[PDB]
């Protein structure tokens, strides 16, 4: 087909332009900066109330409350200062794979292997926790869901498309298509304007929330992309693959910046998060550990090893105080 | 000390009690995961048990001889199995369905799927129950057509029993760890008590083996 050859020529032109726009890599610029050595963190608290594997976790906006999702059909809200249980919500479908906490603190969303995203309201006048909405319309499993303004929620599924829903009416306001494989994770921008998503076909796409069209795409990996997160500046992001490699992509340069890998590590990443200053990059691995990389030099700076199974979820507070990790051993851990 | 936090601690303790009770109530049910090929009698097997929204996973709940069985049918997913198959790492048993009525090389792809699911890195120590269900018209099929089309190396008679045994051993030879797993085989039909009793016996055997492995004696 002539269109296939035209597409190949256009891709070659894009690659040539990307190469031409390049310069000396980030290593040359950051060679002379001071490093940070032995970033040692010790477990402060230990939240033990779950009875099965733990698949998701999200920090509250006040940096004190958090929510965790288990496979026994439980969504638990923890107070991170006294290790107390504020709420324990039982779920209709035990096969969950994600959770989110509203930026105002009123709603919590959970989804999973039943093609439905449930939304629960916390502050009612009867004292209990009621289910507020049940968004349905996806064909594959829900992989990750995030809140925007307590009325709009963006979800990602395992059917190559990710949707944007208006909660009050209950229907897909917008749909985003363009991946070939499953979509595994997404992270909203700090200003909630754009958002990136990683797919199970070794590509990451940047979408504009309004007007609903794919803006950019990046391809540097060799296997599935299993986690993704925005740099706090909002002008870069970090992708964690399934072949023991992390990468830092730039929106404006539209190509790769640096890669984080080691010969000793051969497992697959499961979560990625940053620090308030954008200097430390955490990474939850599959070999029971949790590495802490110096994002400006690629040299490893610390190890968090306290878990008896693979670490599945990882998060950092808004003010930058603590770090929460959660694994398949049914224990969360707060590090500081 | 604490001034108003004592009531919060009391709330947390009651919550912990409720979770422990719910967990110990929910950890008494035998988990079975159902797998098969296209229209391979999975609906018939599901209906034969004693016994819109949520299109993905269909959970059936039944009870036989004071044992509470819970079966997950996940055939209506249509996505990569390698991304969500590890959720079922703790299932007690795996039921597999195969239609003996072989027409376009369905046996080869069924064997491929069985090889992929039997040797998976997650389903070690998990026994596999196997049903060969479409046996009512298998004798008609073999008398109207020979089995050498599926297996050119086949060098046996065209009788029902020998062909059935050949297919059964062909499926059972895909196992790699003959010492860890234990494949059970059954030829099911419009009969029901045989199916439920076979599932019950296999579940009892694997339960006994798991108890022995737990108590150190294994």
């Amino acid at each position, epitope marked *: 087909d002539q269109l296939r050859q035209e597409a190949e020529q256009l891709k070659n032109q894009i690659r040539d332009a990307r190469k031409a726009c390049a310069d000396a890599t980030l290593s040359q610029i950051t060679n002379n900066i001071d490093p940070v050595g032995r970033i040692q963190m010790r477990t402060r608290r230990t939240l033990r109330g779950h009875l099965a594997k733990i698949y998701a976790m999200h920090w509250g906006t006040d940096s*004190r*409350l958090l929510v965790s999702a288990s496979q026994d059909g439980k969504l638990i809200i923890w*107070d991170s200062y006294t290790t*107390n249980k*504020v*709420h324990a919500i039982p779920l209709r479908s035990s096969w969950v794979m994600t959770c989110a906490y509203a930026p105002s603190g009123n709603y919590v969303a959970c989804g999973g292997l039943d093609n439905i995203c449930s939304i629960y309201n916390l502050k009612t*006048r*009867e*004292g*209990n926790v009621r289910v507020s909405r049940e968004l349905a319309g996806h064909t594959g499993y829900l992989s990750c869901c995030r809140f925007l303004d307590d009325n709009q929620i963006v979800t990602s599924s395992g059917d190559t498309t990710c949707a944007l829903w208006d909660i009050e009416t209950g229907q897909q306001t917008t749909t985003f298509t363009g991946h070939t494989g499953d979509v595994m994770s997404l992270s909203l921008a700090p200003d909630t304007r754009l958002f990136v998503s990683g797919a199970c076909d070794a590509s990451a796409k940047l979408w504009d929330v309004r007007e609903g069209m794919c803006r950019q795409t990046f391809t540097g990996h060799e296997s599935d992309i299993n986690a993704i997160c925005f740099f706090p500046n909002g002008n870069a992001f970090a992708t964690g693959s399934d072949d023991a490699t992390c990468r830092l992509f730039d929106l404006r340069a539209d190509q790769e910046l640096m890669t984080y890998s080691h010969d000793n590590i051969i497992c697959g990443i499961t979560s990625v998060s940053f620090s308030k200053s954008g200097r430390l990059l955490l990474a939850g691995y599959d070999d029971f550990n949790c590495n802490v990389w110096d994002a400006l030099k690629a040299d490893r700076a610390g190890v968090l090893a306290g878990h008896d199974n693979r670490v599945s979820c990882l998060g950092v507070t808004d003010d930058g105080m603590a770090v929460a990790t959660g694994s398949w051993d049914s224990f969360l851990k707060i590090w500081n | 000390l604490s*001034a*108003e*936090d*004592k*009531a*919060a601690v*009391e*709330r947390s303790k*009651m919550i912990d009690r409720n979770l422990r009770e719910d967990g110990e109530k929910a950890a008494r049910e035998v988990k079975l995961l159902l797998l098969g090929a296209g229209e391979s009698g999975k609906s018939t097997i599901v209906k034969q048990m004693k016994i819109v929204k949520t299109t993905g996973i269909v959970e059936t709940h039944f009870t036989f001889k004071d044992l509470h069985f819970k079966m997950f049918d996940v055939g209506g997913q249509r996505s990569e199995r390698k991304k969500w198959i590890h959720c079922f790492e703790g299932v007690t048993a795996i039921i597999f369905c195969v239609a003996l009525s072989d027409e376009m090389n369905r046996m080869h792809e069924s064997m491929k799927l069985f090889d992929s699911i039997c040797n998976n890195k997650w389903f070690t120590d998990t026994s596999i129950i196997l049903f060969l269900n479409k046996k009512d018209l298998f004798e008609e099929k073999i008398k109207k057509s020979p089995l050498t089309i599926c297996y050119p190396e086949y060098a046996g008679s065209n009788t029902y029993e020998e062909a059935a045994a050949y297919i059964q051993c062909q499926f059972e030879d895909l196992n790699k760890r003959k010492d860890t797993k234990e494949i059970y085989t059954h030829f099911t039909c419009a009969t029901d008590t045989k199916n439920v009793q076979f599932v019950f016996d296999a579940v009892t055997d694997v339960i006994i083996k798991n108890n022995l492995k737990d108590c150190g004696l294994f």
Partner: single-chain antibody
Amino acid sequence: VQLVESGGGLVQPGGSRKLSCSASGFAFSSFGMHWVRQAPEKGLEWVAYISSGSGTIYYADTVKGRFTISRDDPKNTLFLQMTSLRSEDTAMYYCVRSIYYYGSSPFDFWGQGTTLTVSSSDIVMTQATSSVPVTPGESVSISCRSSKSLLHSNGNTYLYWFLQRPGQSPQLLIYRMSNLASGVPDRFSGSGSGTAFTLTISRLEAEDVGVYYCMQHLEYPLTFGAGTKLEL
């Protein structure tokens, strides 16, 4: 939400009487319950506490050993049994609910009260002012004082501002000195520190006329004290 109670009336000295409080419209089995009485022409005073799950019960030093509180979850009813009534126990009673977790708001709904006529170390808090003459459209301030500091090591003070307009039950205005309760106009505000507290109103209408009470929740027993009165 409804917390309607009954059982009061005319009794004799040395008798006994049971009060019942029937709750409908909320998850009753998750709320701690208080009783609060009020004598004629006087202020509010705490009586009794039963927590959620009946694992903690508190009484007042003036009635300990004579009153007994209990709850019934499946029937959703709060019972209080009273023995050896004296002439001082003539008053009108309120059934109150409260739920404690992080960020909650106790004392958020009061009942309707029942009358009871019988024929014939603790923290003390003072509202020196008894009445204030006001006209609509202006701004007013009310002050409350306590013997010891209410600030705790956690960092949150325990002060509650209630309003009682005439002919009705009290209503929660402010909890923990700075948090506005649900369904409350933004005009009201609270501030202060240590042992001095101030509740300010920016504009006044015909609905903001009544008595104002301050309470502390630092330790039991709970002490209200007399209340400032506003009128036009």
